[PDB]
Design a protein around this ligand. Structure first.
Ligand SMILES: NC(=O)C1=CN([C@@H]2O[C@H](COP(=O)(O)OP(=O)(O)OC[C@H]3O[C@@H](n4cnc5c(N)ncnc54)[C@H](OP(=O)(O)O)[C@@H]3O)[C@@H](O)[C@H]2O)C=CC1
Ligand SMILES: NC(=O)C1=CN([C@@H]2O[C@H](COP(=O)(O)OP(=O)(O)OC[C@H]3O[C@@H](n4cnc5c(N)ncnc54)[C@H](OP(=O)(O)O)[C@@H]3O)[C@@H](O)[C@H]2O)C=CC1
Ligand SMILES: C[C@@H](Nc1nc(N[C@H](C)C2CC2)nc(-c2cccc(C(F)(F)F)n2)n1)C1CC1
Lengths: 413, 415
């Protein structure tokens, strides 16, 4: 039938294997059924170098303008990759630039298929982890104490008066290490607002984990800010949807997440959520099933992408003309989450139906027995997987396109 | 008939339900078969308040003297229990005093029973977690920044050399929080030595998790100290037992433990291991299956105990004469680990055999379907647990005693 009017969507192309999969997704799953007003920005390392990383800021401002962006996995430069593509500078992570310009919080969620076993058996519903990516250990000032001496940390108000001196330690036996770290009230407030809005959107309870029994001033501030914002702006909206917010001790938090069935938002400090990420990805199965959504404190602008990288090994294989089996679920769901938020903003029933139908097609295709090699490894175990247990990248994309056409034709019966 | 010669052992008596189970373990499992030279010390809160915590120092020094101590779970006073017992001072945790006097490191391990389900699928062997319980967030100065201003951190050498001032942050809009924390070289060195000695004692590889990709100076110190001590004093000893040591990112370490099957020593910083403890005990099953061993850097002195507490709720039920189902496996294994180290130091063949036999009897008794209520809930799920699925405390202790007598009598019967 007719194409669904999508609206303004900021698209950002990426690098390598995820870029090939991105083109496949656009050609076979989106454009045949959706007419979009695309604002494309090639965030590949090639075009990010030729523009001195201006295209990244342009795409971030386009997201600020149009409230919804979908992003392909991009190469983050390091020492070896500057020599690989012969770059000028070692440009910063595009994800970090977009995160700073937008000022939101990233939430990771695993896509569940009933036939894909999980390392934590009881997990039935997703555990959406929101990660405060500012300050703490990641903006700290650490140094080696080489000998006996005094380590103090001081606070001096801007007008110069009434300095407060906190004696950290007095080394009289050899040396050791010391460090000071900080965090901002504004960043914590943005983090709390994003977490509350994410919980209200997903319709799930919200938990914040700290160690305020030990760090009574430091983590107590996180607890206080979350509680103030909750009681003043979100309590009634939570109780209406029969959800709730609670502060938890990080010990209790990881324990209860270990023995729960899932289905909640978990707001973590920088170190905690960063330590998680990989582990939750492992516990749910494959990285190709993990999506990320950057939500802003206003709850209006959303930037969706896959939580995995560009899958460099599979691209290295694909360059030689070898058979690859790369999971596209996370990128497809980046597209579907972007389109679903677009439909919510535009009051678009057809686009909402299409995005949900694409998610259902993906999950049903996997649950019926068609999957890539990583999910087949989750089922059978890596050494026991054979070529007949999975489809390759292009075979799986073809199957998804077939089933999507079938379901959207049944949207006319 | 004749008992086994056990040697010198420092015993520390405890509080409440673990004290009851402690007396039961001594009466039914240890004393009938082993004659010990027991240096006993009552670490009950009553006696501890009567002597102003001096019995704790005495017991720690006795452990330092005799190299082996077995400890019952003790009450760490707080706001409530000072009023409960009419305490003079709010006495410090006995575990902390003993640890600081001995200068060792605590290693926690869960006891596996093949019929007890685990929350992580592939877990077959135990993951022994070593906790560096000093410094970092647990000895930090944290504070609220009420408004704009500088937060700096300075190092002032005591010899007289130049000060060093680093900028932590400059608050220009609003305020926030700040904190300073530290660690010490000798503490990290003792931590490393205890971890290496523990790995050599268990015959398992050792992994040290840090975040030195972010804190290149702070955690890099841990990495460098561990590597220096390993290369200088334990490389060939590790290679002989076909084991290894490795540094790991905390991310990769948690994920590896996720998809691992177990069988390695995991040395953690304060925050890491402290956060892990409860979740690890939950993932392997019940808390009553969790043991801890205090291992000193010299590798000579060892102090075993249960990882759980005095189980206060079960003790309240016991006081009112109600039926309880407390798991004694952790305290039994405290005794068996103490006796195993005793037999290792004294080359005591028979005592080592007895300790291993008691551990085997415990594991086999549970695997035969005779368990306390917590393991029964691990199998069936707490709501689906009926009275016929488990035994109470004294029934379980009596069954253990019967099976132990049978095993030792058949060991003599063989020859
Ligand atoms: N969102 C972003 O823009 C991000 C980008 N990156 C960038 O990506 C690049 C590659 O990073 P890398 O370390 O390889 O990590 P990746 O996440 O790209 O992949 C690492 C491994 O995970 C498995 N894997 C990940 N995604 C998939 C998938 N969709 N389907 C199947 N298997 C998958 C593969 O395992 P196996 O080898 O067993 O097949 C792969 O080798 C780097 O330049 C990095 O900077 C990294 C993180 C986030
Ligand atoms: N090693 C030591 O000396 C330690 C001592 N303590 C002290 O112990 C006291 C009580 O501590 P608490 O908070 O109750 O923690 P506990 O570890 O004593 O027990 C808490 C709960 O865990 C379960 N549990 C623990 N051990 C067993 C066991 N052997 N068999 C069956 N279930 C068990 C019970 O759950 P349920 O109610 O569901 O049956 C119990 O109610 C406090 O005064 C504390 O300071 C605390 C920690 C360590
Ligand atoms: C996903 C998983 N999370 C989790 N698990 C564990 N240990 C379990 C026993 C192993 C991994 C299997 N340890 C941490 C962990 C470790 C260090 C620091 C932090 C902090 F920084 F976040 F505080 N967290 N995290 C939940 C338990 C399912």
């Amino acid at each position: 039938s007719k194409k669904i009017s999508g609206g303004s969507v900021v698209e950002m192309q990426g690098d390598e294997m995820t870029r090939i999969i991105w083109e496949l997704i656009k050609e076979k799953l989106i454009f045949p059924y959706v007419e979009l007003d695309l604002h494309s920005y090639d965030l590949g390392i090639e075009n990010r170098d030729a523009t001195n990383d201006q295209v990244t800021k342009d795409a971030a401002e386009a997201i600020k303008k149009h409230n919804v962006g979908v992003k392909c996995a991009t190469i983050t430069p390091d020492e070896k990759r500057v020599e690989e593509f012969k770059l000028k500078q070692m440009w910063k992570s595009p994800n970090g630039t977009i995160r700073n310009i937008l000022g939101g919080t990233v939430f990771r969620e695993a896509i569940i298929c009933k036939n894909i076993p999980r390392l934590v058996s009881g997990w039935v519903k997703p555990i959406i982890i929101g990660h405060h990516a500012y300050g703490d250990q990641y903006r700290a000032t650490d140094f080696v104490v080489p000998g006996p001496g005094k380590v103090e940390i001081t606070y001096t108000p801007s007008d110069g008066t009434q300095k407060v001196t906190y004696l950290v330690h007095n080394f009289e036996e050899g040396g050791g290490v010391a460090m000071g770290m900080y965090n901002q009230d504004k960043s914590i407030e943005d983090f709390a607002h994003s977490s509350f809005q994410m919980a209200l959107s997903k319709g799930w309870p919200l938990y914040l984990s700290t160690k305020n029994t030990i760090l009574k001033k430091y983590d107590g501030r996180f607890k206080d800010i979350f509680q103030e914002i909750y009681d003043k702006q979100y309590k009634s909206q939570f109780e209406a949807q029969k959800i709730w917010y609670e502060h938890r001790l990080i010990d209790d938090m990881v324990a209860q997440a270990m023995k729960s069935e899932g289905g909640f938002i978990w707001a973590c400090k920088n170190y905690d959520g960063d330590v998680q990420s990989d582990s939750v990805a492992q516990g749910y199965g494959s990285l190709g099933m993990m999506t990320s959504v950057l939500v802003c404190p206003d709850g209006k602008t959303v930037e969706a992408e896959a939580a995995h990288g560009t899958v460099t090994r599979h691209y290295r294989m694909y360059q030689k003309g070898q058979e690859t089996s790369t999971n596209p679920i996370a990128s497809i769901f980046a597209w579907t989450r972007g389109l679903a938020h677009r439909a919510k903003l535009d009051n678009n029933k057809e686009l909402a139906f299409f995005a949900n139908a694409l998610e259902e097609v993906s999950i049903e295709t996997i649950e019926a027995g068609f999957m890539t090699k990583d999910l087949a490894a989750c089922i059978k175990g890596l050494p026991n997987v054979q070529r007949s247990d999975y489809l390759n990248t292009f075979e799986f994309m073809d199957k998804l396109g077939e089933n999507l056409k079938i379901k959207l034709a049944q949207a006319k019966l």
